[PDB]
Amino acid sequence: KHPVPKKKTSKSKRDMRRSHHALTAPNLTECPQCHGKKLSHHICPNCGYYDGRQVLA
Amino acid sequence: HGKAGRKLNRNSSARVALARAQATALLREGRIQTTLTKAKELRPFVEQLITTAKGGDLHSRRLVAQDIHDKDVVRKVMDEVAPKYAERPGGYTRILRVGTRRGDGVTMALIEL
Amino acid sequence: MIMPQSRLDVADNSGAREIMCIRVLNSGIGGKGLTTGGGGNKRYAHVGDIIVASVKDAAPRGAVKAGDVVKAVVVRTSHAIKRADGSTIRFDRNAAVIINNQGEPRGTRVFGPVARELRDRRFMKIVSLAPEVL
Amino acid sequence: QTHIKINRGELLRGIEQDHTRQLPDFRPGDTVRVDTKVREGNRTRSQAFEGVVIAINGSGSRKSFTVRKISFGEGVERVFPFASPLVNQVTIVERGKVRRAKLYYGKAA
Amino acid sequence: MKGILGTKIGMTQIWKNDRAIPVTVVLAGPCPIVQRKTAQTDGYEAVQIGYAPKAERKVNKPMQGHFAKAGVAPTRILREFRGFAPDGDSVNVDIFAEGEKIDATGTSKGKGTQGVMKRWNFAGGPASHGSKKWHRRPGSIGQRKTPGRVYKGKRMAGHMGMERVTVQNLEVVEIRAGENLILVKGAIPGANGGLVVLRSAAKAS
RNA sequence: AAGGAACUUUGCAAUCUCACCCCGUAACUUCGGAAGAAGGGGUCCCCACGCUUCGCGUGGGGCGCAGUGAAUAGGCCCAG
RNA sequence: AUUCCUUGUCGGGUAAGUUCCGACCUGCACGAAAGGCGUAACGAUCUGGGCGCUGUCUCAACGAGGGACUCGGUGAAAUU
RNA sequence: GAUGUCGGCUCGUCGCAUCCUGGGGCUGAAGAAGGUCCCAAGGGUUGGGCUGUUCGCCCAUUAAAGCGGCACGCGAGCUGGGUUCAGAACGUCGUGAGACAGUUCGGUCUCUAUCCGCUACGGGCGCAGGAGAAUUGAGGGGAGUUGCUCCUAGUACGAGAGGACCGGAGUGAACGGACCGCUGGUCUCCCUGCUGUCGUACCAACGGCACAUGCAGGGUAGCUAUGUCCGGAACGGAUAACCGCUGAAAGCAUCUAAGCGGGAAGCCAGCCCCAAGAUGAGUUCUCCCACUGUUUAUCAGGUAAGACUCCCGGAAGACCACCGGGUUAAGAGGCCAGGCGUGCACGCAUAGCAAUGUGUUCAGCGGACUGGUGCUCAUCAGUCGAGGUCUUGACCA
Ligand SMILES: [Mg+2]
Ligand SMILES: [Mg+2]
Ligand SMILES: [Mg+2]
Ligand SMILES: [Mg+2]
Ligand SMILES: [Mg+2]
Ligand SMILES: [Mg+2]
Ligand SMILES: [Mg+2]
Ligand SMILES: [Mg+2]
Ligand SMILES: [Mg+2]
Ligand SMILES: [Mg+2]
Ligand SMILES: [Mg+2]
Ligand SMILES: [Mg+2]
Ligand SMILES: [Mg+2]
Ligand SMILES: [Mg+2]
Ligand SMILES: [Mg+2]
Ligand SMILES: [Mg+2]
Ligand SMILES: [Mg+2]
Ligand SMILES: [Mg+2]
Ligand SMILES: [Mg+2]
Ligand SMILES: [Mg+2]
Ligand SMILES: [Mg+2]
Ligand SMILES: [Mg+2]
Ligand SMILES: [Mg+2]
Ligand SMILES: [Mg+2]
Ligand SMILES: [Mg+2]
Ligand SMILES: [Mg+2]
Ligand SMILES: [Mg+2]
Ligand SMILES: [Mg+2]
Ligand SMILES: [Mg+2]
Ligand SMILES: [Mg+2]
Ligand SMILES: [Mg+2]
Ligand SMILES: [Mg+2]
Ligand SMILES: [Mg+2]
Ligand SMILES: [Mg+2]
Ligand SMILES: [Mg+2]
Ligand SMILES: [Mg+2]
Ligand SMILES: [Mg+2]
Ligand SMILES: [Mg+2]
Ligand SMILES: [Mg+2]
Ligand SMILES: [Mg+2]
Ligand SMILES: [Mg+2]
Ligand SMILES: [Mg+2]
Ligand SMILES: [Mg+2]
Ligand SMILES: [Mg+2]
Ligand SMILES: [Mg+2]
Ligand SMILES: [Mg+2]
Ligand SMILES: [Mg+2]
Ligand SMILES: [Mg+2]
Ligand SMILES: [Mg+2]
Ligand SMILES: [Mg+2]
Incomplete structure (x- = not known):
């Protein structure tokens, strides 16, 4: 029992591994009213608009 | 695998006390804020309970009363809201995505009548 | 479905009350005597299957005695039997009829019903001692 | 797909x-008599199973009922396709007063 | 040679003469011809027919071009059949006769990732004789220092299902043409509402 | 499901048993015991009657698959 | 709990018994307060057999819950 | 400054000195059943009793119950019965402490895989434009077992008893794949019954708790094997032992020295599965087309065809991927109808001293099933995506 790594992993390796941790930036749209930005199919967090006006102020 | 419903990391009793509490709450106040999922999972239980209350007879009251343990809310859903929904073939509710919370990263949401 | 270790009650006056299974065989009954095996393995005996068995309880006074071994042929499974119409038969208890190596029963008569499937497997004499061919 | x-x-x-x-x-509980035809080689015999109905099951071509009989000291149950060619006819003999729809409990008696 | 497309509707009980046949109900709805591949056109002999209908509003410019060239009207599904002709288009009428043995291909119901028992039929382990978390595992995966490796192809846990499967010599029990239905004995892979291709026998019997 | 120790070093493990009342109970013995040996029955609701009450006996009636109706709750034996 | 030869030999039980029981005596290498041979009763002792019951097994299924997986938060270790 | 050691379990795979099964020479081969030898490693090689066993003996079968290798394969895979720690006892040895490869009872087997290797699944780029689809199969994997009965035929053979090759038919066992219609299992809140208690003011009716379903009885869809369907081949091409044709050296003879044919469960092909990262990157059908940018800005921008993101789902699934729908809309939920499960609701009435019975009531209730329906959410929108290098040759106006 008790596996353990045989050898330090190179800085190079370690970083090759990390080639996939890129965050994915939001696709962001600009609210058709109050004008800041929002997520598709969410309520625009600036005004509160989702066609008329749902969340409060 | 056509199975249906959500485990919601809970035991059968919990799962039930959930849908009942959140039903009681949504009916107590027209709209509530909750996890997007718990919402998804709440919509059809409450919508149905409405359809039950839409009967008006005493049977349908006692029926609703098993799932909804607060008199005042029962009385509300029997006498006030079911009669309003009178003409709508179901779809008594809707869901809105508010979005991500700070503590635990979770898309909240809004559910209402 | 019978398998080694699987006790059944006996449906004849042969004198064995209770036999325990021991081997299963896929021998039939053809031309000269019985036949010799359908292969080596075969794990489950059902109705119209010869098995091999050792006597476990017997009548004081009777042909067959406690410990005797002897072939038997299986006449009532608790398992289900599917005939080619969809009909299904199934008996409360598991039972067989001890036989000799021509297939003919060692007893004077069969007790309780037997599965008509015995007719299929050409067990005429057994099928004839029988109170009922369900 | x-x-x-x-x-x-x-x-x-x-x-x-x-x-x-x-x-x-x-219905489950009712006693019934099933007049079945059997084929014995060229011959067509008529045999007749009669007992308690302990379960009905399925529907459509798949529907089925289950008669339980005691015969010659031994318990037996049988299962018939409503549309088995080998089931000629079914006759109610007595009506049961049953609380369930399955009756398995009768399997001790 | 012979072949056609359709959907697995379900399984049911019928009687021919006096035995209860289990039958799978297939709908081999009509297939338009779409493309005819020959030697001097494509190198090899085949025909490409199509199955489920599809509205224009869901059809690629290029796909529309394709279908339009043979003027057929569009289909959610195309497939090829080696060595096949007639003219016009293709219904299971004529293409199959009752009694004829056919080969049914589909896509088995997928099971996701499955341990060595469920997937390969491993023996598992002692549910009780002091077995220490080795109840479902696959035992050993090799030898020792010869050959200090693990065989290529060694059966182990993995994606079971969702695979292409062909059952051979299924018997055409019934044909209701003009409901485009074939009643087929036995069982075809893949779930209800799934795609199936029906073919002549691969084998002479 | 069917089978029932075919498992295995070994029934290891897990099940069966399970409270109270009545019936009943072996070899053997230092006559204390072994012994809860073994085994069988009963158990809930209503009503009337009797009796020493919280209760129980008796009779008849009632309902369910099932009445220590859920929880606590001995598996037994033979022989070294 | 002592036997090397050893699965001693016969009987028992078992379909089949290197184990267990009884008998035998050829005790490699029992034996009388380092006690000898018995002994009812007592044992989370050890050994064999039975009844019952069982997923221990043929042969594994389906289900549940807690992890494992995914996202946001904090973020080790032996080893090299 | 550690290469864990017997046996079992689990998992395989190799050799052939072949246990079976296939082909063949010889036979002290009539037939049938054998013996031995040669070719043959495709597949197959059972369950039990005793022992820690390996082995071996026994029970009962079988076509057969093959022998070995893989650190006497496999303890970062499990066991831990054998053996070799400490305890204790017997026998024996020793004056003793102690001892024995004698026996006996007891006795801790280490949550995290870094690399190679392996099974699965994505991301990247590549394949001389950007796209949607349909495909050839270089190459690779799986599969490859057998009995029994019947006909031939009571024929060949045989004094007889008996009893065939060959060819044809039929039915199983094990194993494999798929499937869920059937027969069953399960189905953690779909339906009902039940008990103690706490609650909903009380009655009535209900909810919680008694498992992480309080117990019980059923139980759809899913998912399952013990359930069902199908499979191993047929034909062909090269061969092994072996059988021959023609035929010299060697006037005869010889299967060979030139040549030629017949010949196995084996080889290659045919079956099923993967397969162009087959960088040697293949073929076909189709769609978009020839845009913009003071080389102070010689590589990018806005785009087309087309996708992705996001939402709602899915018989797809760890994630990713895959399929569907996304208002020109039946994608899921709801709602309606139906199916199916449970089995006769609540309330009221009646009978009854009551428990409770009966009627209203084939009722009531409702997870996954089948359809319909614009009641709900799939709003709005963003992101990305061509302009096609050169060389030679052929045809063309
Ligand atoms: Mg969690
Ligand atoms: Mg005896
Ligand atoms: Mg059923
Ligand atoms: Mg799936
Ligand atoms: Mg297992
Ligand atoms: Mg190497
Ligand atoms: Mg059972
Ligand atoms: Mg035993
Ligand atoms: Mg125990
Ligand atoms: Mg006494
Ligand atoms: Mg007692
Ligand atoms: Mg009753
Ligand atoms: Mg009673
Ligand atoms: Mg207990
Ligand atoms: Mg002996
Ligand atoms: Mg002795
Ligand atoms: Mg002493
Ligand atoms: Mg995290
Ligand atoms: Mg070292
Ligand atoms: Mg080391
Ligand atoms: Mg050593
Ligand atoms: Mg081999
Ligand atoms: Mg060695
Ligand atoms: Mg080794
Ligand atoms: Mg190792
Ligand atoms: Mg040990
Ligand atoms: Mg001494
Ligand atoms: Mg790794
Ligand atoms: Mg190839
Ligand atoms: Mg390659
Ligand atoms: Mg291969
Ligand atoms: Mg003849
Ligand atoms: Mg003769
Ligand atoms: Mg079904
Ligand atoms: Mg079912
Ligand atoms: Mg008050
Ligand atoms: Mg009350
Ligand atoms: Mg409480
Ligand atoms: Mg509490
Ligand atoms: Mg609970
Ligand atoms: Mg609790
Ligand atoms: Mg239950
Ligand atoms: Mg199978
Ligand atoms: Mg079968
Ligand atoms: Mg040839
Ligand atoms: Mg993608
Ligand atoms: Mg998802
Ligand atoms: Mg309905
Ligand atoms: Mg409910
Ligand atoms: Mg629907």
Whole structure:
């Protein structure tokens, strides 16, 4: 029992591994009213608009 | 695998006390804020309970009363809201995505009548 | 479905009350005597299957005695039997009829019903001692 | 995975009904007599199973009922397709007063 | 040679003569011809027919071009058949006769990732004789220092299902043409509403 | 499901048993015991009657698959 | 709990018994307060057999819950 | 400054000195059943009793119950019965402490895989434009077992008893694949019954708790094997042992020295599965087309065809991927109808001293099933995506 790594992993390796941790930036749209930005199919967090006006102020 | 419903990391009793509490709450106040999922999972239980209350007879009251343990809310859903929904073939509710919370990263949401 | 270790009650006056299974065989009954095996393995005996068995309880006074071994042929499974119409038969208890190596029963008569499937497997004499061919 | 507009039901039920037959209104608990024809080689004998109905099951061509009989000191149950060619006819003999719909409990008696 | 497309509708009980046949109900709806591949056109002999219908509003410019060239009207599904002709288009009428043995291909119901028992039929382990978390595992995966490796192809846990499967010599029990239905004995892979291709026998019997 | 120790070093493990009342109970013995040996029955609701009450006996009636109706709750034996 | 030869030999039980029981005596290498041979009763002792019951097994299924997986938060270790 | 050691379990795979099964020479081969030898490693090689066993003996079968290798394969895979720690006892040895490869009872087997290797699944780029689809199969994997009965035929053979090759038919066992219609299992809140208690003011009716379903009885869809369907081949091409044709050296003879044919469960092909990262990157059908940018800005921008993101789902699934729908809309939920499960609701009435019975009531209730329906959410929108290098040759105006 008790596996353990045989050898330090190179800085190079370690970083090759990390080639996939890129965050994915939001696709962001600009609210058709109050004008800041929002997520598709969410309520625009600036005004509160989702066609008329749902969340409060 | 056509199975249906959500485990919601809970035991059968919990799962039930959930849908009942959140039903009681949504009916107590027209709209509530909750996890997007718990919402998804709440919509059809409450919508149905409405359809039950839409009967008006005493049977349908006692029926609703098993799932909804607060008199005042029962009385509300029997006498006030079911009669309003009178003409709508179901779809008594809707869901809105508010979005991500700070503590635990979770898309909240809004559910209402 | 019978398998080694699987006790059944006996449906004849042969004198064995209770036999325990021991081997299963896929021998039939053809031309000269019985036949010799359908292969080596075969794990489950059902109705119209010869098995091999050792006597476990017997009548004081009777042909067959406690410990005797002897072939038997299986006449009532608790398992289900599917005939080619969809009909299904199934008996409360598991039972067989001890036989000799021509297939003919060692007893004077069969007790309780037997599965008509015995007719299929050409067990005429057994099928004839029988109170009922369900 | 081929998304075709199609009532699966009605297509099934189509076929499934050329092979559907309805028998008297017997219920679980009711005693019944099933007059079956048997083929003994060239011959067609008539044998007749009669007992308690302990379960009805399925529907459509698949519907089935289960008679339990005691014969010659040994318990036996049988299962019939309402539409088995080998079931000629079914006759209610007595009506039962049953609280369940399955009756398994009778299997000790 | 012979072949056609359709959907697995379900399984049911019927009687021919006096035995209860289990039958799978297939709908081999009509197939338009679309493309005819020959030697001097494509190198090899085949025909490409199509199955489920599809509205224009869901059809690629290029796909529309394709279908339009043979003027057929569009289909959610195309497939090829080696060595096949007639003219016009293709219904299971004529293409199959009752009694004829056919080969049914589909895509088995997928099971996701499955341990060595469920997937390969491993023996498992002692549910009780002091077995220490080795109840479902696959035992050993090799030898020792010869050959200090693990055989290529060694059966182990994995994606079971969702695979292409062909059952051979299924018997055409019934044909209701003009409902485009074939009643087929036995069982075809893949779930209800799934795609199936029906073919002549691969084997002479 | 069917089978029932075919498992295995070994029934290891897990099940069966399970409270109270009545019936009943072996070899053997230092006559204390072994012994809860073994085994069988009963158990809930209503009503009337009797009796020493919280209760129980007796009779008849009632309902369910099932009445220590859920929880606590001995598996037994033979022989070294 | 002592036997090397050893699965001693016969009997028992078992379909089949290197184990267990009884008998035998050829005790490699029992034996009388380092006690000898018995002994009812007592044992989370050890050994064999039975009844019952069982997923221990043929042969594994389906289900549940807690992890494992995914996202946001904090973020080790032996080893090299 | 550690290469864990017997046996079992689990998992395989190799050799052939072949246990079976296939082909063949010889036979002290009539037939049938054998013996031995040669070719043959495709597949197959059972369950039990005793022992820690390996082995071996026994029970009962079988076509057969093959022998070995893989650190006497496999303890970062399990066991831990054998053996070799400490305890204790017997026998024996020793004056003793102690001892024995004698026996006996007891006795801790280490949550995290870094690399190679392996099974699965994505991301990247590549394949001389950007796209949607349909495909050839270089190459690779799986599969490859057998009995029994019947006909031939009571024929060949045989004094007889008996009893065939060959060819044809039929039915199983094990194993494999798929499937869920059937027969069953399960189905953690779909339906009902039940008990103690706490609650909903009380009655009535209900909810919680008694498992992480309080117990019980059923139980759809899913998912399952013990359930069902199908499979191993047929034909062909090269061969092994072996059988021959023609035929010299060697006037005869010889299967060979030139040549030629017949010949196995084996080889290659045919079956099923993967397969162009087959960088040697293949073929076909189709769609978009020839845009913009003071080389102070010689590589990018806005785009087309087309996708992705996001939402709602899915018989797809760890994630990713895959399929569907996304208002020109039946994608899921709801709602309606139906199916199916449970089995006769609540309330009221009646009978009854009551428990409770009966009627209203084939009722009531409702997870996954089948359809319909614009009641709900799939709003709005963003992101990305061509302009096609050169060389030679052929045809063309
Ligand atoms: Mg969690
Ligand atoms: Mg005896
Ligand atoms: Mg059923
Ligand atoms: Mg799936
Ligand atoms: Mg297992
Ligand atoms: Mg190497
Ligand atoms: Mg059972
Ligand atoms: Mg035993
Ligand atoms: Mg125990
Ligand atoms: Mg006494
Ligand atoms: Mg007692
Ligand atoms: Mg009753
Ligand atoms: Mg009673
Ligand atoms: Mg207990
Ligand atoms: Mg002996
Ligand atoms: Mg002795
Ligand atoms: Mg002493
Ligand atoms: Mg995290
Ligand atoms: Mg070292
Ligand atoms: Mg080391
Ligand atoms: Mg050593
Ligand atoms: Mg081999
Ligand atoms: Mg060695
Ligand atoms: Mg080794
Ligand atoms: Mg190792
Ligand atoms: Mg040990
Ligand atoms: Mg001494
Ligand atoms: Mg790794
Ligand atoms: Mg190839
Ligand atoms: Mg390669
Ligand atoms: Mg291979
Ligand atoms: Mg003849
Ligand atoms: Mg003769
Ligand atoms: Mg079904
Ligand atoms: Mg089912
Ligand atoms: Mg008050
Ligand atoms: Mg009350
Ligand atoms: Mg409480
Ligand atoms: Mg509490
Ligand atoms: Mg609970
Ligand atoms: Mg609790
Ligand atoms: Mg239950
Ligand atoms: Mg199978
Ligand atoms: Mg079978
Ligand atoms: Mg040849
Ligand atoms: Mg993608
Ligand atoms: Mg998802
Ligand atoms: Mg309905
Ligand atoms: Mg409910
Ligand atoms: Mg629907």
